[PDB]
Amino acid sequence: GIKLATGANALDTAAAIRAELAKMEPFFPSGLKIVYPYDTTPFVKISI
Amino acid sequence: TDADIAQVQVQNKLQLAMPLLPQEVQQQGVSVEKSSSSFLMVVGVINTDGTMTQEDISDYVAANMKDAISRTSGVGDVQLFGSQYAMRIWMNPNELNKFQLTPVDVITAIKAQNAQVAAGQLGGTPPVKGQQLNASIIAQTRLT
Amino acid sequence: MPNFFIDRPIFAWVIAIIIMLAGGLAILKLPVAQYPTIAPPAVTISASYPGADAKTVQDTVTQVIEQNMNGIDNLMYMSSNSDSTGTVQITLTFESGTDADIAQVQVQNKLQLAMPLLPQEVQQQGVSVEKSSSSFLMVVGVINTDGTMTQEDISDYVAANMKDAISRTSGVGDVQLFGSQYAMRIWMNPNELNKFQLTPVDVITAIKAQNAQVAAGQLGGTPPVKGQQLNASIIAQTRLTSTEEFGKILLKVNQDGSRVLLRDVAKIELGGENYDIIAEFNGQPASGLGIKLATGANALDTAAAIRAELAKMEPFFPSGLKIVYPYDTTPFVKISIHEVVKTLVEAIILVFLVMYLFLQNFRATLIPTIAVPVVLLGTFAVLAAFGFSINTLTMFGMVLAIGLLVDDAIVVVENVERVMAEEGLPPKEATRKSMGQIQGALVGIAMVLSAVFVPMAFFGGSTGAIYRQFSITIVSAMALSVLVALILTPALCATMLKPIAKFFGWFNRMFEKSTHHYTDSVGGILRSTGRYLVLYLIIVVGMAYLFVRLPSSFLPDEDQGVFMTMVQLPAGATQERTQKVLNEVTHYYLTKEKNNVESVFAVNGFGFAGRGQNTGIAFVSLKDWADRPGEENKVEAITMRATRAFSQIKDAMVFAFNLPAIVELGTATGFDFELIDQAGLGHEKLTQARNQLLAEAAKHPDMLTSVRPNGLEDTPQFKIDIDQEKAQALGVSINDINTTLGAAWGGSYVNDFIDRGRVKKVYVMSEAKYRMLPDDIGDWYVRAADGQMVPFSAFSSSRWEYGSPRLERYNGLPSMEILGQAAPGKSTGEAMELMEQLASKLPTGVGYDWTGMSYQERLSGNQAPSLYAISLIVVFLCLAALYESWSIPFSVMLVVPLGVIGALLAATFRGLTNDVYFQVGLLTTIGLSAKNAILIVEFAKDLMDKEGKGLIEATLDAVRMRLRPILMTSLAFILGVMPLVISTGAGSGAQNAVGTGVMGGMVTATVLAIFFVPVFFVVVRRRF
Amino acid sequence: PGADAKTVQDTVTQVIEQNMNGIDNLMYMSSNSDSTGTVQITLTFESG
Amino acid sequence: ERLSGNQAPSLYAISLIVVFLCLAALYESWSIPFSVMLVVPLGVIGAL
Ligand SMILES: CCCCCCCCCCCC
Ligand SMILES: CCCCCCCCCCCC
Ligand SMILES: CCCCCCCCCCCC
């Protein structure tokens, strides 16, 4: 449950999270994929 | 108002109260986060094979990918929807009764025989005249 | 706006006076350092757990802290070390521009709440969070030679009488201390612990509660009774001062009434806190300090105040102490500033000489003498307005921009003298016409160059702070020169210059016949211009060929006056053997360099491979530069001769080295490559993964060289396992066993006490001779449950097994920091790629990560052509805006490869590298050649349409009238740095890096690029 | 709490006041320690 | 208080310099502000 720090921008924070997850992804065990439920980030980008 | 100056002042007024809190609160560790109120996003880690239960996935997320997401610049607080592993010891009251024990001797034995002991060096400083050896004494390690 | 100032000279003088008065007011108020803040801010958590090893610290203190360093703003990475002396060292590196106070307070508040999780001994020793600033400003050592005291007496005289007062002065910060202060040490003795039937647990419990306070209230305490007259405070039992009081504690009284004391089972001997570091100065013991310059005080008067405060303490010394300075890099700063100031002043003298040589009038040869220093004063005012300081970088920014400084007076005065000499006008109307000819051209120069430098201000990393100094100093100086060039110089050419019209006349005849021969040759080579175009193609291909074959680097290596010598002994060597090797090094430097080396300060257990006992360092400080003349006496020769002479020591790795700036060495070659372990593989399997990664980099010598692991290998350790059934059947508690073993063989730190006003510590530990062999564990007896003494090895064993003397972690995962450097010939863009293609065939779980100096080379490390790509088109648009045409900028911007040939030829011939002074000098040379090419074609453009001339005729007419300025201002500049080039003294590494580029590039850009721009302009006006 | 206004000055006041050099502005710094038990330092910075 | 005793002549000097320069800048003469920067004592004797 990733919250957000006070005053941070919500689009280049989520980009940093998705950049961290692509760094620790080739070291998962056999058969463990990461999936993406609830997310309020792409609505801002699609509206702009 | 400034956010991090506000966190510094709240932390200043909290650390004056830390010696008055109980020991069981301090060992869990209090925390001061400048989070917003709620969730920007949640991630999800399913198993497609069917080799891991809830606890295995929760321990993998707690150990190998929580402490790096929680240091990412712009993240106020990370909630975990699981639990890290812990060497859990489920006691039996009838067997503690049969062998005439309490749950106090159990905690005493776990504090005594699961220690990480500092034990010095056997070529330590100050040496005598003509010392030719230096190594460390390894007393006992934490159990694994 | 010069016509407003022709009629109004006094207003021009007034704004010249306010800019020259705001410059000199800001030279009294700005710092003078050696280098600015150049590294990203990094804070350091340092803690100690006495008696442990790397493993015990690495999973009770290290992993416990760095699980709680979360939620810190602007954090790049975090690397930690845990070594066998007990020390844990965590370095958090932040983004550039992050406020260091906010970063330190966030780290220290996240550490203040992770404090009850740590062990008790770590909380007693304390955890120190402090910011990792620059290295030492100066080292103040102190010796005693008239007599004999130990190291600890000197270190306590410093810790009680100097550090209190040296830190209370103008502009100091962190003050370290090489020695160790007092502590009431207690040396236990296990045979009297045996015969009186005692344990060290009884000793520590007996002298916890002897020196403590009593909250005792007061007589007449409140609430008083009705009629109370007396009020006074109860002063109850207090601490213990002398050593007899620490010897008179009762331990145990027996049945016969025996008195057991600390002076029966121990000896006291007040002594030292830490016994690992032993400083040394030439053969007598010593102590030292660690003074850091804080933020914004100049180092010159700071070091003068330090020397003044040490100068008023010699009446207060205990008859034999002597202060001595084994490391001082303050007079090198004074040399490196004085030489730059002398170069500026002699450049002004040389332009005075050249202006009088070409013009032959005293009255008009001092317009640059008035108008050039006022721009430098205004440049200092702008540097203080930004908040920057007197670095070495801004000083060598104004010493190579002085051509751009001095052109904007030579052009104006030559043009008004040309108008008075040809058409014959009074100076006022002649200055009006002259500054109307070059009106828009100087504004076009201000727009066209301001865009050559200012992309240099917007790079990133630790080298975007080196370039920013040059790229705001030169921009401010030039953009103030263009303001003062159309305001102050027109007023001075309208007022000072004489209206009088008209035998050393050989130079005039030589110059006019050279001018006519030049115009004849240029008019000859404007017909059939194909050969000069293909010669330009050969020029640009030769430029690319010599630009590829040239070694890139950073800031040059130079003589700071001192150098280090590093000593490391193999794998578990004691303190005495390292002292013998350090004394061999001292006896070498003080006999074979009698006339070069002044003082060697030898520190033991300090070396840069980590803390320990088999290591040592030596600060060697030489004589003055005037006392050691020659080439064979500089540091570059002494270092290699000592390194050649240190190969005969049979078992010691000893080598000497110099100091680059602080840290970003490898001149552009190093790696900082972390091998990280992103699973639960461990330490031995990670060692196998590193040992597989090494000797695959050894398979490629053409790309990789010197891949050293940067980490200590496994050493034997003494495992003693407590057998549980024998310990508990005999009735011996495990806690008393562990607090006997880890308090007889390490420190224990009972509590504090008060000595001579100050507050010192009390440590208990066994003697120096009862804890030195594996056969000494059998001399330690422990009380059982009944009271029978049980020995060690009645319930234990003993094994030797391999452990680890240093454990490294990177971002919370275990890692090993493999260092390397690229081969000669190949850059570090095709070496880091081979590392990433070579670290991908490792076993499953081991990953890689770049750190340090290469970290910001991954984050957009190819944005150097991406900013000059948008500089070049802004230059093109400004030049297409000026001449009211397209493809005329193509006629003026093909002089960029002309000033690069000479700089690359001089750098190849003299044997220099592609350091930052070469790049800034190249980048000024191309801008000044562009300035000359702009002015010749602005005359040729506004001569063939305002008058009506042809194409060839107007071109050689324009290059006729624009030959007297160009070699006038090259001759005053490829002559105002000649000395800098032939300079060999103190600090001639940066001076030769500045001098060689801006000599050869300037000579080539004025010899060749006065013959190509008529050809370029004619070829453009043929094919549009 | 166990004070006599000289233990406090020599053990918990001179330490802190000794370790307050490196702060930027400062101006002046007045400290006091009494026999009640308490102690306070007052660091008066520059105006602005 | 003593700080205001140490920055008053510097204040008077810098104000007289800036007013002399702002008048020489605007009347295009160095002799007209010289006939104005000595009518100042006729006002200062009044204030005193
Ligand atoms: C350095 C101060 C020089 C003072 C101004 C010189 C005199 C101005 C000449 C104006 C002629 C009308
Ligand atoms: C340590 C002070 C350095 C100041 C350098 C001033 C250089 C001024 C050059 C222009 C006047 C000749
Ligand atoms: C740096 C200024 C030195 C003083 C030069 C002023 C010269 C003014 C001459 C006025 C015309 C004769």
Ligand SMILES: CCCCCCCCCCCC
């Ligand atoms: C005879 C070869 C030289 C051709 C003329 C060169 C003219 C450029 C130099 C002018 C100054 C001597």
Ligand SMILES: CCCCCCCCCCCC
């Ligand atoms: C820097 C590249 C810009 C290319 C623009 C060239 C346009 C030339 C047009 C010629 C028409 C006369």
